[PDB]
Design a binder for this molecule. Structure first.
Ligand SMILES: [Mg+2]
Ligand SMILES: [Mg+2]
Ligand SMILES: [Mg+2]
Ligand SMILES: [Mg+2]
Ligand SMILES: [Mg+2]
Length: 160
RNA sequence: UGGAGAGUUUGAUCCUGGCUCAGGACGAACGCUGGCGGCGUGCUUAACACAUGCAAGUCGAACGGAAAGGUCUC
């Protein structure tokens, strides 16, 4: 009952005396589609096995995403090894304006209204890691107001 | 009120970094094809050389007059 997206599958190799031993990696995104998403790498000698391992890794590594009604609360910039991803909230009309990896992550997390731009490296793994880093950096109004005081010193027009 | 990427250096990897493509636009040209209407638009090159016709006249209520028409007129 989850949403699973396999993002990138590539064939890696290792050289031995005989020749090249091939294997497969399959980066997988898994999320409940509502507010919670996980990422798992996964790797094996066969594509379905790698996909499976990615699925269990992601499902074990679920984490929670702060939404404010179908979009993220405030703009953020996430930083992976060398991938840079910029996310900004948008009005309810907009869709998900994102690239491949970022779109996978956001649509599995259950985000409907986002402008996502990748500025650093183009590797899919690092783009995914930067996106999850930005989602970690995200904040909620309720604990920012808990940290500061008098939880009205913000702007909460919609609510619901 | 608005921002999408992909291919390509390696046995494989991650960076750096060029090259290339997917969009739009045109006072356009060319290829194939071609029913109609509405509204626009048409020498971007030789400020090269130009046949022909037309693109600046008007006033008799300023004037002397009488080539033309109309006149009473011989
Ligand atoms: Mg770069
Ligand atoms: Mg080399
Ligand atoms: Mg080597
Ligand atoms: Mg490149
Ligand atoms: Mg000219």
């Amino acid at each position: 009952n989850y949403l699973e997206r396999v993002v990138a599958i590539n064939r890696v190799s290792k050289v031995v005396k005989g020749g090249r031993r091939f294997s497969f990696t399959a980066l997988v995104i898994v999320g409940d589609g509502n507010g919670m998403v996980g990422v798992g790498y996964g790797k094996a000698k066969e594509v379905p096995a790698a996909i499976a391992k990615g699925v269990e890794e992601a499902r074990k590594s679920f984490f929670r995403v702060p939404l404010i009604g179908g979009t993220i609360t405030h703009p953020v910039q996430g930083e992976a090894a060398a991938g840079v991803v910029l996310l900004r909230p948008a009005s309810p009309g907009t869709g998900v304006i994102a690239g491949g990896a970022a779109r996978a992550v956001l649509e599995c997390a259950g985000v409907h209204d986002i402008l996502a731009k990748s500025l650093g490296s183009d590797n899919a793994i690092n783009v995914v890691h930067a996106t999850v880093a930005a989602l970690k950096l995200l904040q909620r109004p309720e604990e920012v107001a808990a940290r500061r005081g008098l939880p009205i010193e913000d702007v909460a027009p919609a609510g619901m």
